[PDB]
C-alpha cells in the first residue's frame, strides 16, 4: 500500500494519453488533454461562504465509506477524484474508498489505484450500470455512513464534516453538498450558486429551481443553513448506511442511467425522511452535455418505474407531458409496492403539498395545462391585466406570465383572467378579462388534433399574426401557421 | 330639492372628443345617467346578506373641469346603487372649475351638497375641505368619473365598523376611456410601488394566492392604496392627521397616507366583494410630482428615502417646503419606522443592500442585462427590459462586483472579444471586479482597458471588449447611490 502523495501519477495517466493530433473530446465527452495537464492534487479556489470558512468543524463524527462508481473514466479525472477525497478529508473520517469498476474495458484503470491507501477496488465482470454498481459498493461498505460520489469530482475545503454532522444528528437526513461546476472544456473550477434548490417539471426531468424571494429573505439570518430540497441531483450525496438499507436501497431493476435520483428523492421524503443541500459543503463536478458510454427508452423505463410506484394518480400528469412514455414497457414493480406499504409511506399528494408546493399542479378537471406553444414562441400576458391585450414571447419554461390552463368550462385562463373574444370581427384583438362561466365570449375549443384553438360557436381561430401590430387576434380559421397552438400538458 | 331620477340629464349634459378630458366625451355623453353595468363580482359575494345597523357615510367627491355626463353618472351611481339610509350625504367639492354651474346644477339633487373652491386648491386640500364639512361617522372618497356597482358600499362599511383603524378599498373595475365599456378587473391584485415611488399593481404571490383558495373573497392586505377610491373612519382620518395640507394639485396622495396609516398602527385593505368602476386614462388634463413625493419620502421613509433619490436624482433639486408639523405628527402618533413597514407590510419590495454602490436593472437602451436563466459557468446576455426585475435584477457591490443573486460577472479571459461568464461571487477574485466610468454610463473591468460589451450578444453572449466610443458599451443602472 502507498500514501497518496507517493503515488506515481505520471506513470498511471501516461499509458492512456491523447495522441498525435487526435480529438481530446472523443473518449469522455470532456477535454481529456486539459484534464491530463492537471496535477492529481491541483489547487482549487475556496468557493465557500465566508461564514463556513470561519468555522471550527467537529471531527467527533462517524467515519464514512466513500463509494465511487465508474465505467471507462479518464484516468487523470478518476485519480484526481480519489486524491481530492484523501487530501481534503480528515483521515480518521475516511474509513475506506470503494472503487466500483463497472466493467471498464481496461481493468488496470481501477486495479492500479488499488495500491493507494484506503482504496479498495471492486470489479464488475459485466456491465451493471450506475444504480446496481452503487448498491454493490454500499453492500461492501464497512462504515456506518455512506458517501456517494461521481468518478470526475473534486472535493473542496472541509467538504465532508458538514455533511456528516447532519446525518450524525439525525440518521433520516439525506444530504448533499453544493455541486460546484468543473468546466468540461478548460477544466476550470467554478463556484456554483448557493441560492438553488433541486426540482422538476411534470415531464419528470431534473432541473434547478431558484429559491423563492420569500425563502431567500427568511434565511438572511443564517445564509449557510441547510436547505430543504424536494429533489437531489443524485450523483453526490451522503446517507446513513443502515437507513439506506432499511428504505430499500436502490430500485434494483433500473438500468444504466436514470431516473434513480427521481425515485430515491420521492421515497426518502414520502417515507419520513428528509433531503438537504448543505452550503458549507462544496464538491466540484465535471458537468457535460452528453454521455460517453436506447437512451430515451432506458430513461423512460426507469422514470416510469418511479412514477408508477410513488406518484399515485398524479402520474397521469407525467403521461400528459410525455405521452410517448405510455408505450414504454417498464417491468415488474411488485417488491417496490410492497416496500412502500411496509414502510407506511405518505401519499404523493402529501409530498406535493408539504415538500414541493411551488410545483404548479393542474386542477383535476382542467382539460389542458401549462404553456401554450407556437413554435419556439409561447402565449404570454406581457404582464398585462384586465382589459389588457395579449401576446407572444419566446418560451422560457419559467412558467409565469406563460402559465395557462384550458378549463372544463371551455375557458383559456391565466390566473383568474380569461381570453375573451370582445369583438367577433376578423382581425379583432382579443382581451384579457375576469373569468365568468356564463360568458360565451370566453369559450374556446381545441381542434385539428389539438393543434389549434377555435372560438366556440364560430369559424374564428386564435391567431398570432397581429402580435406585432397590437397583439393576439381572432382571425378566420384557416391553414395558417400563426393559428398553430399546443398545450404542453393534455388530458 | 329633487329625486335623482327626476333630474333632467338631457338638459344638464346639453352644455375632438378626447380634447377636454383625455377620455372619449362623445361616448360618455351617449350614456344614460343610470346606465346598466355588468355585475363583476365573485359568485360568493352575490350570495350574501348584510347588516343594517351599519354606519352611514358621507361621500366626498372632488372635481376640476370634469365632464358633466361622467360627474352626474358618478353621483347617480352612488345614489342608485347604495342603500339610502347608508348615504347621509354626497359632498361635491368643486375645485375651481371654469364653469361653476357644472357642480352648482347638481346641487338640486337629493343629498347632494356642493362646495366650491374660489381658487385652485388641488385634490388633497379639496378632499380635506369636504371631509371637514362631513356630518357622517364614516368618510367615503371617490373620483369624479366613477361607476358604483351592486352592493358596493356594505362590504366596505362592514369592515371599518368592526375596526375603525381599517382603511378600505374596493376592487377598482376598469371603465374604458375610448368606448366606455365597463370591464371587470382582476381580484388577484395588490397595490404597490417601485423605488421611483410610482404606484403600480402587483400580482399576489402564488404562496398568498394559494392560502386564500379557502376563502377567495376575503379582505386583502395591501401595502398601498391606489388612492382615488377609499373608505375611512372620519374620526380616525382626523386623528391620523387628515392629509398633508402643503401638498399640491398633483398626486403623491396615495403614497403618503398609505405609509402613514400602516406605520401608525392602522391597516390598508382591498375588498373584493366591493366593486367600483373607474375611468382609467393615459394622461392628465410633473414637479409638484416630485414635490409632493419628496414631502412624503422625507417624512416617512427615513434613510430609505435615498433609494428614491437614487432612482430619481433630478428630485434632489426640487424644493418641497416645510415639513415640521408632519414630523411632529409622526412623533406624537408614536409611529413605527420605515424599516418596519418594509419588513412587515411590503417585504416583496426588493431592497438594495446598504453598501451597494448601484442597483436594479442594467440598462442599455430598451435592452437590459439578463442572465438568460443561465447559472454558474453560464454566459450572459441582453433581453428587452421588462421592469419585472427577475433575471434582470442586478447589483454593483462595495466589493466592486456586478452581482445577480450570489452570482457574479466574471472576466474569465482578458483577450478582447472574449465572452464573460457567470460565476459564484468571491471577494478575493480580481476577475470579478468592475468600475463605473464616463459619468456612470459604462462598465470598465478594474485593472484594465476592458469594457463590458454587448456587440457579441447575438454571437454567444456579452463580451469583454477594448474600451471605446461604441454604443454597445453603454450601461446604466436604474438606481445609483451617488
Amino acid at each position: 500500500k502507498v500514501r497518496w502523495p507517493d503515488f506515481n501519477q505520471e506513470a498511471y495517466v501516461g499509458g492512456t494519453m491523447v495522441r498525435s493530433g487526435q480529438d481530446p473530446y472523443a473518449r469522455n465527452k470532456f477535454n481529456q488533454v486539459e484534464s491530463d495537464k492537471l496535477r492529481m492534487d491541483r489547487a482549487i479556489p475556496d468557493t465557500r461562504h465566508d461564514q463556513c470558512q470561519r468555522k471550527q468543524w467537529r471531527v467527533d463524527l462517524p467515519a464514512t465509506s466513500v463509494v465511487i462508481t465508474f465505467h471507462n473514466e479518464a484516468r487523470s479525472a478518476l485519480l484526481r477524484t480519489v486524491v481530492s477525497v484523501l487530501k481534503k478529508s480528515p483521515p480518521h473520517l475516511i474509513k475506506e474508498i470503494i472503487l466500483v469498476d463497472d466493467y471498464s474495458n481496461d481493468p488496470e484503470d481501477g486495479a492500479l489505484l488499488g495500491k493507494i491507501e484506503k482504496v479498495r477496488v471492486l470489479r464488475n465482470d459485466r456491465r451493471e450500470g450506475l444504480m446496481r454498481s452503487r448498491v454493490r459498493g454500499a453492500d461492501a461498505a464497512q462504515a456506518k455512513v455512506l458517501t456517494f460520489l461521481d468518478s470526475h469530482c473534486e472535493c473542496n475545503e472541509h467538504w465532508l464534516e458538514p455533511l456528516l454532522e447532519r446525518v450524525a444528528e439525525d440518521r433520516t437526513r439525506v444530504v448533499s453538498p453544493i455541486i460546484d461546476v468543473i468546466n468540461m472544456d478548460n477544466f476550470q473550477y467554478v463556484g456554483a450558486s448557493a441560492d438553488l434548490k433541486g426540482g422538476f417539471d411534470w415531464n419528470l426531468v431534473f432541473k434547478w429551481d431558484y429559491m423563492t424571494p420569500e425563502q431567500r429573505r427568511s434565511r438572511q439570518g443564517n445564509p449557510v443553513a441547510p436547505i430543504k430540497t424536494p429533489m437531489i441531483a443524485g450523483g453526490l450525496f451522503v446517507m446513513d448506511k443502515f437507513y439506506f438499507e432499511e428504505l430499500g436501497k436502490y430500485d434494483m431493476m433500473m438500468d444504466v442511467w436514470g431516473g434513480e435520483n427521481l425515485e430515491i428523492s420521492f421515497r426518502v421524503w414520502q417515507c419520513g425522511g428528509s433531503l438537504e443541500i448543505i452550503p458549507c459543503s462544496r464538491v466540484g463536478h465535471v458537468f457535460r452535455k452528453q454521455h460517453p458510454y436506447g437512451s430515451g427508452t432506458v430513461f423512460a423505463r426507469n422514470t416510469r418505474r418511479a412514477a408508477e410506484v410513488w406518484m399515485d394518480e398524479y402520474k397521469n400528469f407525467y403521461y400528459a407531458a410525455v405521452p410517448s412514455a405510455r408505450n414504454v414497457p417498464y417491468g415488474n414493480i411488485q417488491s417496490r409496492l410492497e416496500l412502500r406499504k411496509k414502510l407506511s409511506c405518505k401519499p404523493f399528494k402529501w409530498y406535493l403539498e408539504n415538500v414541493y408546493p411551488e410545483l404548479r399542479v393542474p386542477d383535476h378537471q382542467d382539460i389542458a395545462f401549462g404553456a401554450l406553444q407556437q413554435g419556439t414562441n409561447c402565449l404570454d400576458t406581457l404582464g398585462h391585466f384586465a382589459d389588457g391585450v395579449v401576446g407572444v414571447y419566446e418560451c422560457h419554461n419559467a412558467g409565469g406570465n406563460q402559465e395557462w390552463a384550458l378549463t372544463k368550462e371551455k375557458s383559456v385562463k391565466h390566473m383568474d383572467l380569461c381570453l375573451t373574444v370582445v369583438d367577433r370581427a376578423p382581425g379583432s384583438l382579443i382581451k384579457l378579462q375576469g373569468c365568468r362561466e356564463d360568458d360565451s365570449r370566453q369559450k374556446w375549443e381545441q381542434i385539428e388534433g389539438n393543434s389549434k384553438l377555435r372560438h366556440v360557436g364560430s369559424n374564428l381561430c386564435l391567431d398570432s399574426r397581429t402580435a406585432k401590430s397590437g397583439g393576439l387576434s381572432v382571425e378566420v380559421c384557416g391553414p395558417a401557421l400563426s393559428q398553430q397552438w399546443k398545450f404542453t400538458l393534455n388530458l | 330639492k329633487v329625486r335623482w331620477p327626476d333630474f333632467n340629464q338631457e338638459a344638464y349634459v346639453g352644455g375632438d372628443p378626447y380634447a377636454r378630458n383625455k377620455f372619449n366625451q362623445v361616448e360618455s355623453d351617449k350614456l344614460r345617467m343610470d346606465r346598466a353595468i355588468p355585475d363583476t363580482r365573485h359568485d360568493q359575494c352575490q350570495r350574501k346578506q348584510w347588516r343594517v345597523d351599519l354606519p352611514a357615510t358621507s361621500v366626498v367627491i372632488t372635481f376640476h373641469n370634469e365632464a358633466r355626463s361622467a360627474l352626474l353618472r358618478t353621483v347617480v351611481s352612488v345614489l342608485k346603487k347604495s342603500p339610502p339610509h347608508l348615504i347621509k350625504e354626497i359632498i361635491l367639492v368643486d375645485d375651481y372649475s371654469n364653469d361653476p354651474e357644472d357642480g352648482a346644477l347638481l346641487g338640486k339633487i337629493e343629498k347632494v351638497r356642493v362646495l366650491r373652491n374660489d381658487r385652485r386648491e388641488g385634490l388633497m386640500r379639496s378632499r380635506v375641505r369636504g371631509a371637514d364639512a362631513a356630518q357622517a361617522k364614516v368618510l367615503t372618497f371617490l373620483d369624479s368619473h366613477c361607476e358604483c356597482n351592486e352592493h358596493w358600499l356594505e362590504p366596505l362599511l362592514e369592515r371599518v365598523a368592526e375596526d375603525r383603524t381599517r382603511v378600505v378599498s374596493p376592487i377598482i373595475d376598469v371603465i374604458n376611456m375610448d368606448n366606455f365599456q365597463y370591464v371587470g378587473a382582476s381580484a388577484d391584485l395588490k397595490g404597490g410601488f417601485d423605488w421611483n415611488l410610482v404606484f403600480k399593481w402587483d400580482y399576489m404571490t402564488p404562496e398568498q394566492r394559494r392560502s386564500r383558495q379557502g376563502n377567495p373573497v376575503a379582505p386583502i392586505k395591501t401595502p398601498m392604496i391606489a388612492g382615488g377610491l377609499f373608505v375611512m373612519d372620519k374620526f380616525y382620518f382626523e386623528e391620523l392627521g387628515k392629509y398633508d395640507m402643503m401638498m399640491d394639485v398633483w398626486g403623491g396622495e396615495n403614497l403618503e397616507i398609505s405609509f402613514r396609516v400602516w406605520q401608525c398602527g392602522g391597516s390598508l385593505e382591498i375588498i373584493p366583494c366591493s366593486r367600483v368602476g373607474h375611468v382609467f386614462r393615459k394622461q392628465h388634463p410633473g414637479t409638484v410630482f416630485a414635490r409632493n413625493t419628496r414631502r412624503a419620502a422625507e417624512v416617512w421613509m427615513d434613510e430609505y428615502k435615498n433609494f428614491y433619490y437614487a432612482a430619481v436624482p433630478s428630485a434632489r433639486n426640487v424644493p418641497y417646503g416645510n415639513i415640521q408639523s408632519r414630523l411632529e405628527l409622526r412623533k406624537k402618533l408614536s409611529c413605527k419606522p420605515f424599516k418596519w413597514y418594509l419588513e412587515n407590510v411590503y417585504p416583496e419590495l426588493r431592497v438594495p443592500d446598504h453598501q451597494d454602490i448601484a442597483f436594479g436593472a442594467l440598462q442599455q437602451g430598451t435592452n437590459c442585462l439578463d442572465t438568460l436563466g443561465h447559472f454558474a459557468d453560464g454566459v450572459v446576455g441582453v433581453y428587452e427590459c421588462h421592469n419585472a426585475g427577475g433575471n434582470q435584477e442586478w447589483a454593483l457591490t462595495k466589493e466592486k462586483s456586478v452581482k445577480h443573486m450570489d452570482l457574479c460577472l466574471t472576466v474569465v479571459d482578458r483577450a478582447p472579444g472574449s465572452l464573460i461568464k457567470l460565476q459564484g461571487c468571491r471577494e478575493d477574485d480580481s476577475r470579478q471586479k468592475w468600475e463605473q466610468i464616463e459619468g456612470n454610463s459604462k462598465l470598465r473591468h478594474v485593472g484594465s482597458n476592458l469594457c463590458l460589451d454587448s456587440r457579441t450578444a447575438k454571437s454567444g453572449g456579452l463580451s469583454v471588449e477594448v474600451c471605446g466610443p461604441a454604443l454597445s458599451q453603454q450601461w446604466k443602472f436604474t438606481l445609483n447611490l451617488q
Binding site: 461546476v181 456554483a192 431534473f206 443524485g234 458537468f287 454521455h291 | 459557468d377
Partner: peptide, 5 residues
C-alpha cells in the same frame, strides 16, 4: 445528462 448548477 444532469444539468449544471
Amino acid at each position: 445528462s444532469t444539468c449544471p448548477a
